[PDB]
Amino acid sequence: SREEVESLIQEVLEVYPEKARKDRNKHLAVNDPAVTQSKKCIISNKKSQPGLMTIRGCAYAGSKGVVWGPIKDMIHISHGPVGCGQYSRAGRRNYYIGTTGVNAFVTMNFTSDFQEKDIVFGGDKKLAKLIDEVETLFPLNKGISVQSECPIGLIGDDIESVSKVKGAELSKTIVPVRCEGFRGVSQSLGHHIANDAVRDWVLGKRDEDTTFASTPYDVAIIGDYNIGGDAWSSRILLEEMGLRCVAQWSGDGSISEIELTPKVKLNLVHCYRSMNYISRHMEEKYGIPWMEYNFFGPTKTIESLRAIAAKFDESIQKKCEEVIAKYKPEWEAVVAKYRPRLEGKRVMLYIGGLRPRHVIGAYEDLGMEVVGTGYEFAHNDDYDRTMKEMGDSTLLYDDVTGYEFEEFVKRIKPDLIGSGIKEKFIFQKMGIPFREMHSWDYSGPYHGFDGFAIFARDMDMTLNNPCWKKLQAPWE
Amino acid sequence: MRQCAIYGKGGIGKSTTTQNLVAALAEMGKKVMIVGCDPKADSTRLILHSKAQNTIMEMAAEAGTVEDLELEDVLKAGYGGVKCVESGGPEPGVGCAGRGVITAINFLEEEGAYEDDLDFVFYDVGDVVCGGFAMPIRENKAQEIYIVCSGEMMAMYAANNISKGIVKYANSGSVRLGGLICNSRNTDREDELIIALANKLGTQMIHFVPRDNVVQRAEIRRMTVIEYDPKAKQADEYRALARKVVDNKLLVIPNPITMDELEELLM
Amino acid sequence: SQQVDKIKASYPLFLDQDYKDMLAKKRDGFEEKYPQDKIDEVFQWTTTKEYQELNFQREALTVNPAKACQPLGAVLCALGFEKTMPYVHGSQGCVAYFRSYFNRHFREPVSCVSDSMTEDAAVFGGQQNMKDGLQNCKATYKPDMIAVSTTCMAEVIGDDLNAFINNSKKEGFIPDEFPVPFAHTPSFVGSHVTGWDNMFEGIARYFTLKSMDDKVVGSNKKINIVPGFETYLGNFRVIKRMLSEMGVGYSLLSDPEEVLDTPADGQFRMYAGGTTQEEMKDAPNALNTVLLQPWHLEKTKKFVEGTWKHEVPKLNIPMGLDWTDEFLMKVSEISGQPIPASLTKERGRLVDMMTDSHTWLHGKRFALWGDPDFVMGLVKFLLELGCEPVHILCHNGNKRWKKAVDAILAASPYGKNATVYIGKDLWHLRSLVFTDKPDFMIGNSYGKFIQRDTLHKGKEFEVPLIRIGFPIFDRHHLHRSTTLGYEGAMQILTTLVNSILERLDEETRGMQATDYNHDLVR
Amino acid sequence: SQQVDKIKASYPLFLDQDYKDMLAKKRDGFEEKYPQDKIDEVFQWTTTKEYQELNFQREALTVNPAKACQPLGAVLCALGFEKTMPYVHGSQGCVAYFRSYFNRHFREPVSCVSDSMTEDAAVFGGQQNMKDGLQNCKATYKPDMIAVSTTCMAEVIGDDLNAFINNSKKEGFIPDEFPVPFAHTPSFVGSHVTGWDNMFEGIARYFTLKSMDDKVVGSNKKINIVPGFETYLGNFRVIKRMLSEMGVGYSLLSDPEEVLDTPADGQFRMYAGGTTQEEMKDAPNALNTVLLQPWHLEKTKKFVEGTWKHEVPKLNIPMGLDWTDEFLMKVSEISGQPIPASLTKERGRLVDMMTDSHTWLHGKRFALWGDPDFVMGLVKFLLELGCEPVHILCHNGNKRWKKAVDAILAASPYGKNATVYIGKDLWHLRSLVFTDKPDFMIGNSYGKFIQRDTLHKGKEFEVPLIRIGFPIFDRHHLHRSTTLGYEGAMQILTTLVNSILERLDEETRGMQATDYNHDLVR
Numbered sequence A: 001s002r003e004e005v006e007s008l009i010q011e012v013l014e015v016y017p018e019k020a021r022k023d024r025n026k027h028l029a030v031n032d033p034a035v036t037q038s039k040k041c042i043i044s045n046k047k048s049q050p051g052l053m054t055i056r057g058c059a060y061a062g063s064k065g066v067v068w069g070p071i072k073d074m075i076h077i078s079h080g081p082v083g084c085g086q087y088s089r090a091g092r093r094n095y096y097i098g099t100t101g102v103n104a105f106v107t108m109n110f111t112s113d114f115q116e117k118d119i120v121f122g123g124d125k126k127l128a129k130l131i132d133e134v135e136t137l138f139p140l141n142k143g144i145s146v147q148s149e150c151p152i153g154l155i156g157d158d159i160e161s162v163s164k165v166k167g168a169e170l171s172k173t174i175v176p177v178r179c180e181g182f183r184g185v186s187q188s189l190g191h192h193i194a195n196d197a198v199r200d201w202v203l204g205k206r207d208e209d210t211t212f213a214s215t216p217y218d219v220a221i222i223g224d225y226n227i228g229g230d231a232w233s234s235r236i237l238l239e240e241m242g243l244r245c246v247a248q249w250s251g252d253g254s255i256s257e258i259e260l261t262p263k264v265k266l267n268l269v270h271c272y273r274s275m276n277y278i279s280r281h282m283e284e285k286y287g288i289p290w291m292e293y294n295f296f297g298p299t300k301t302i303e304s305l306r307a308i309a310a311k312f313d314e315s316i317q318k319k320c321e322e323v324i325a326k327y328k329p330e331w332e333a334v335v336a337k338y339r340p341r342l343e344g345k346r347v348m349l350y351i352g353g354l355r356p357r358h359v360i361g362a363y364e365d366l367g368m369e370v371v372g373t374g375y376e377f378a379h380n381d382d383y384d385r386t387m388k389e390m391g392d393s394t395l396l397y398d399d400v401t402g403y404e405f406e407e408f409v410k411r412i413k414p415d416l417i418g419s420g421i422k423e424k425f426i427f428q429k430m431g432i433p434f435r436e437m438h439s440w441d442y443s444g445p446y447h448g449f450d451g452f453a454i455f456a457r458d459m460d461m462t463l464n465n466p467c468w469k470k471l472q473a474p475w476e
Numbered sequence B: 001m002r003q004c005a006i007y008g009k010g011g012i013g014k015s016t017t018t019q020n021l022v023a024a025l026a027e028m029g030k031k032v033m034i035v036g037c038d039p040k041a042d043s044t045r046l047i048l049h050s051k052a053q054n055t056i057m058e059m060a061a062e063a064g065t066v067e068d069l070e071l072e073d074v075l076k077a078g079y080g081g082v083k084c085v086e087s088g089g090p091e092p093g094v095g096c097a098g099r100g101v102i103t104a105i106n107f108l109e110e111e112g113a114y115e116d117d118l119d120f121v122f123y124d125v126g127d128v129v130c131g132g133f134a135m136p137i138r139e140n141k142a143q144e145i146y147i148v149c150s151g152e153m154m155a156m157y158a159a160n161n162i163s164k165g166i167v168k169y170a171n172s173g174s175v176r177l178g179g180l181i182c183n184s185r186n187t188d189r190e191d192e193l194i195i196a197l198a199n200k201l202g203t204q205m206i207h208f209v210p211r212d213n214v215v216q217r218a219e220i221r222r223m224t225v226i227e228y229d230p231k232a233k234q235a236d237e238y239r240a241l242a243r244k245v246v247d248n249k250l251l252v253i254p255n256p257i258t259m260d261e262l263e264e265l266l267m
Numbered sequence C, D: 001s002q003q004v005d006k007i008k009a010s011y012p013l014f015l016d017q018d019y020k021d022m023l024a025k026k027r028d029g030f031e032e033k034y035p036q037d038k039i040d041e042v043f044q045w046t047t048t049k050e051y052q053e054l055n056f057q058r059e060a061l062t063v064n065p066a067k068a069c070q071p072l073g074a075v076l077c078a079l080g081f082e083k084t085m086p087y088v089h090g091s092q093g094c095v096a097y098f099r100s101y102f103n104r105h106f107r108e109p110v111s112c113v114s115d116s117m118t119e120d121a122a123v124f125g126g127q128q129n130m131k132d133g134l135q136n137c138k139a140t141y142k143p144d145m146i147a148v149s150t151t152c153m154a155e156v157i158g159d160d161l162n163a164f165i166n167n168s169k170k171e172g173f174i175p176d177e178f179p180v181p182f183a184h185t186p187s188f189v190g191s192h193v194t195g196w197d198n199m200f201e202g203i204a205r206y207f208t209l210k211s212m213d214d215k216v217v218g219s220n221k222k223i224n225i226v227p228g229f230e231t232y233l234g235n236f237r238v239i240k241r242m243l244s245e246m247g248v249g250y251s252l253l254s255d256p257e258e259v260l261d262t263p264a265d266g267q268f269r270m271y272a273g274g275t276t277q278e279e280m281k282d283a284p285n286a287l288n289t290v291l292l293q294p295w296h297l298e299k300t301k302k303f304v305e306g307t308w309k310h311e312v313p314k315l316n317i318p319m320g321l322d323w324t325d326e327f328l329m330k331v332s333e334i335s336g337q338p339i340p341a342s343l344t345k346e347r348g349r350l351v352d353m354m355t356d357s358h359t360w361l362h363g364k365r366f367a368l369w370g371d372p373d374f375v376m377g378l379v380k381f382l383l384e385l386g387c388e389p390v391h392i393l394c395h396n397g398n399k400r401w402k403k404a405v406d407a408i409l410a411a412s413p414y415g416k417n418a419t420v421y422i423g424k425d426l427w428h429l430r431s432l433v434f435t436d437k438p439d440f441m442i443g444n445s446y447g448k449f450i451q452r453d454t455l456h457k458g459k460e461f462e463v464p465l466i467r468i469g470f471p472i473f474d475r476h477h478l479h480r481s482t483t484l485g486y487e488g489a490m491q492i493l494t495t496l497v498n499s500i501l502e503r504l505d506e507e508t509r510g511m512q513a514t515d516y517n518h519d520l521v522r
């Protein structure tokens, strides 16, 4: 496995008309465990070439999809036509607790349902009557996030002004969040737009209010959308380590919980690409140190369980160890049961801006070696954290396209692969075990100790399931 | 039945020059229609007799949806049996007018405003700002375009600028610049200067329209010069523009010129 | 905690007392959540008649639709024509959604692409992406055809797809003879069903408008079949089977069936089956064109009747018993072939199941929703079985439609107790089932929550959800069944009688309480 | 009381406080019923491991079978041969039950007659009734054939059906050439499946034994298909469809399909379809005979291999994926025709649903029961899907069978946690689902009570019942589905994944309690 990926790449990229050819050839390169930047090795976060079967989303998927949607005590209005909203109703599996319809409104979809006329005459006039109709039909709503779509960005409506007026009027916070589809290359801008959107309308409200008590342990889990319960699977360990979990950004989040982040002693950031932006304003404006952690599998969580510890006093540290000792027998037990089955079996991944690099450790522990990865909206700084987590011949892709991915899969010949729904089937047809990574394929928590357990089991039920051996019919 | 779209830099003379051309064309006993593809909504005000009637978009607002409107509601006959319809639009600084142009045109076509009557259909197109205001010149809309101009450095930059945009829809489609129509702002050597530009462009200067104050007498009195003062000097002029258009067979693909060659002309 | 040989997933894990504790401390700790009292209160409120009027007096907010945009309905149309590429002019996230969505329902590959129009696109218009995109896509995935679609992004800016396409041709990016049909698909107008019309008609024209001069009405003596937005493959197959067993010559324009069901045998197939262009090209020569779901194919009819000069039949969607005999009868009037003794048997076999199941179904009050043709279809068949179609909602329906349905209800005694609802979203129906409670609901997976909300109020108030329609994400492989004609009607019926029988078994499975009515046979 | 516009039936009525009062007074007044305390006690007891051993040590009492007598399996066999009359020699109430029973399942007419053997019959034998009965029946219902059967009554008194029949002939009651096959059907021996063998073979002989001298093996180049006791019409149809779409010649010996499904169109049809005698007569001239359920057609094979000299294939019931390709492959080995690309697709489409649904079905522990071929079939396919077939009961199974199934379980790891049970009745399985609890049960309507009893213990102990098999009385029109081959396997699967999905939706629909795992898509 030396200069093959190159013979692979330049062959996959052989079909691309020269306009795209030069471009793509720079998004996929061989990983040297040693560089510390990709300005030299690979390129990410650029415009996607037309009609190429990208999986990349839009700025909306970032604001109403990943960041805002997840706030259970708020009502996120999908301002714009009637398609975006409906398509993402309950798409993301960010779990929460509450009475939907009454107290929480997440598996719910509110839209301004733009019609022909709304577009012509533009419509803040509608958005306002609509911000009213909520306060009256959903009293327990504790604020309103207005996620913009593409039309709003072209028509040029002042959804920024209305939210000040209605809200200044209704004595309720309203976040004029701008997440226009035509904006940014990927979904990435959505995040950056969300982050800022938060430090401005929500975050800076409890500033002259000190009826709160900062404990030398108070912290917040930032960037754990809690897909499947990962946020709870982690909020459990921190708390069992003695730290006091105060906030959780997007994932059973409370609008108020987000408002108490400024008072904490430390910001724990799992998802770097999404809340990295905010965590810095979190530290400049307020002056609250933050760090990156990883709760995928034993060795990562165990390790991290100590890093967050050292940022405090010895007190918490001895307590930490107790937690590690507690789960030590459980996770060891898991490996003893499943590593035997997953050992040797190699795996190929493709995701957004975190899991691509963050799941490998969870794998190392199970003995599955990762021979390929990629992001759909990460940047060089995100790959900066990848090269190390990887091997040498390893092939990496950034905004990989059907042809690009499919041919690598056809050639690298993986035992297991992990990516989204759009891809889940293409490979399940080539008889290659596929395990959804985005939605965890509707399976239990993967973060933390309890999570690792399910994971180590979910790779086994799919990878070694009987189905695969039954693909090619006998007569053939 | 021909369909001609009339363009220009706003404030040179699109509406009067058109409503007067069709007024004349009506005089010749032609079945004509004027689609007002402009937010201002005065493209028919001179043939119908008032500030403006009920527009498509404004009208479709009342019924909730455009699909709920009826041609009967926007289409009104006026002088010499000329039919008129307005595209409608939002007010200064809100909404999207470029859309109305689309919505209104799609509507007329959709409701068969074209199918059984007319000889000429004139789209009075406002500012060519974006996608929507190009609607009058795709396939099945307008085949002849008559850019209006004057002897002003900015009047031509526009005549030039507009035709440029046309080559986009002209190459791929069949729409063609038929010629320019000059409304003398009584600038010097304005006459041939335009003829100059019409050549460096690849078209003709259909006709030259005088600066005759009978147009304000008619404009302010709520009517066209042809119904106002049938024999007035500029009444015939507008009749000439009509006759020339009818018999015109020259439709080309514009050839924009560069600022340099442009200012050269004037200079 | 997690024990190895009995791993607890999403559900048992947070139930553990250790986790409950956690959540409580979080809730009492930083959520500043309202006290259950008022939460229960506000809920108690929404479930009332007072709240309902408030609800319906609604005019600007919409909570939980029963519709989607046009581009989604376009893409499905395109999937039907052999080796074509659903191509969507505009943003890429939509294509990402259009795809993800069609995946969860059919659970198979959904190929579609987009010119990825970035910020500059909106500003400068989208000419090069259309130009290149047509080239790249055509070069990479090697379609035989590409049918362009558009998001709001292209609509507002008013990108002329036509011109944009032709420049690319003249400009030398794609073979001038390469089929590239288009349609403007304003997501902010009509609905997904509408997209299908615009998308279809677009193609109906690309192959026929120019070549109209040499085609004769009924040159190939066949019968055109226009589906419309249809997501149950069983329906595509069933309609083909009948005509086919009639010895009727037909041509199904836009047929998804192979492509949305490519076998998992080791070879991935981006394309399969589909309507041939040469077939779409030759369409005019047929005897006549049939539109299965005409209420969202209104622009097709205008063309077919207008350009092809086809005397298009005034037929309803082939659902239930009557509408089916009518469908077949008319096909019989046209192809020349008799209604096979085969099909007649089938009919009688359906009427047999009705007489046999009539007792349980008789009088069951339902609430239901979906597309205009579906609901108009379902409702009908519900009267045939003798059920009261109490609340009928159709979010993307229109006035001419509503009236048509009311009349279908004025005809039978079972229907006079039902009201129609158009332009009303799901959240409205949440109220309807509370103030005037159904027996069951017949809709998509989205009706999973209206179900839940009725239970929280009281088990005696819970309204079970029977899943017929689209989407259907919480269940597997239903997309394969049929809802059209006799065949698909045998199933609708069984689904309900057994949907009812099941509830009765649950309502009466209480020991020494309700079990006396636990009849072994029903 | 009852109010006119809201009539409360059997279950709502007795719930009314007025009626509850009544029952309490009856109970406390004249029932001398035990106090709930000990009732709950005795129950609590039966649901234990202590009770189970006691249960199984059982050796004389039987509680709730999973079999029926032989005459019932005979009658169904007969229904299969064209225009024949299920004729049962003996008591008349037997056929009155045989009929009533087959009704509730298929819910169509079930014709069968009986020589009403009164008391004198037992005492003097049953000659006249056989003599007359053959005449009367043959005269009234005008058959082409009458296949004689026998209730307990004739077996003991050992009436020679053969002699009895021939006397009637010679004695001149029925045309000597009139087909009247027969078979002693000792209800007190074997089971209903056994009757089907005896009844079939009887006929397989009547038309061949004498004529063996002039038939050549494979003279018509066709393939015989012996179904056996089968009650899902979908299975008769599906097996015919495959061979038929293979271009394979065949003859379904014993074909109920038309007769058990006569269209209600105004004309009653005592007979329809069926296997022609001239067809059964010519049977030996085929290439080879195939037995879809060998485990209850053991006497047929003896004859076919012996008299017809057919090299009968060693195939298992065509269920699940592997046993189907094997069925088709072998048919391909014989007919000459290859496996059509059509069928191959189908297969791949099934494997697609497996890969697609594998997650939910993986590891689900089941308890099941039915006939020997069915259970052996179902179990198999359950391992294919990757479920643990924990408790496998087969009341009419035997030793050679049991140990063939165990071995099928020895192969896969998903089968190493399951036990087989033969000669054990339902009441035994009631215990097994309590001591070692499933997920669900897969049986007939009789398993409706094992379900109820699990709930009374605790909702968290309730074992839902998935109805596959026979009987199925508490549901409607399931008799039309299929359980054999690919087609009938697409269904089995959907029926579980969605059987599971449904439960997860019920277990998790508690607001702010378990509804968090209420995923919109699964």
Ligand SMILES: Nc1ncnc2c1ncn2[C@@H]1O[C@H](COP(=O)(O)OP(=O)(O)OP(=O)(O)O)[C@@H](O)[C@H]1O
Residues within 6 Å of the ligand: B009, B010, B011, B012, B013, B014, B015, B016, B017, B038, B040, B124, B125, B126, B127, B183, B209, B210, B211, B212, B213, B215, B216, B219
């Ligand atoms: N023949 C003419 N000579 C001099 N001035 C004229 C003549 N015809 C029209 N005008 C003047 O031109 C001005 C605008 O005329 P017109 O209605 O044609 O405007 P326009 O620019 O075409 O409108 P829009 O661009 O808003 O569609 C009025 O002030 C009018 O008096």
Ligand code: CFM
Residues within 6 Å of the ligand: A066, A092, A187, A223, A225, A226, A227, A271, A272, A273, A274, A351, A352, A353, A354, A355, A356, A437, A438, A439
């Ligand atoms: S694909 Fe995380 S940067 Fe974002 S929806 Fe998933 S690998 Fe996202 S960890 Fe996350 S909770 Fe996600 S899985 Fe950062 S939030 S835009 Mo698709």
Ligand code: CLF
Residues within 6 Å of the ligand: A058, A059, A060, A061, A081, A082, A083, A084, A085, A148, A149, A150, A179, A180, A181, A182, C069, C070, C071, C091, C092, C093, C094, C097, C150, C151, C152, C153, C187, C188
């Ligand atoms: S990037 Fe307009 S209705 Fe909504 S899916 Fe579109 S066609 Fe349909 Fe992102 S903000 Fe939304 S999903 Fe902009 S428009 Fe796509």
Ligand code: SF4
Residues within 6 Å of the ligand: A154, A155, A156, B095, B096, B097, B098, B099, B129, B130, B131, B132, C156, C157, C158
């Ligand atoms: S420039 Fe044109 S497309 Fe853009 S918002 Fe204005 S009128 Fe609409």
Ligand SMILES: [Ca+2]
Residues within 6 Å of the ligand: A425, C106, C107, C108, C109, D352, D353, D356
């Ligand atoms: Ca699939």
Ligand SMILES: [Ca+2]
Residues within 6 Å of the ligand: C352, C353, C356, D106, D107, D108
């Ligand atoms: Ca029946």
Ligand SMILES: [Mg+2]
Residues within 6 Å of the ligand: B014, B015, B016, B038, B042, B043, B124
């Ligand atoms: Mg004007």
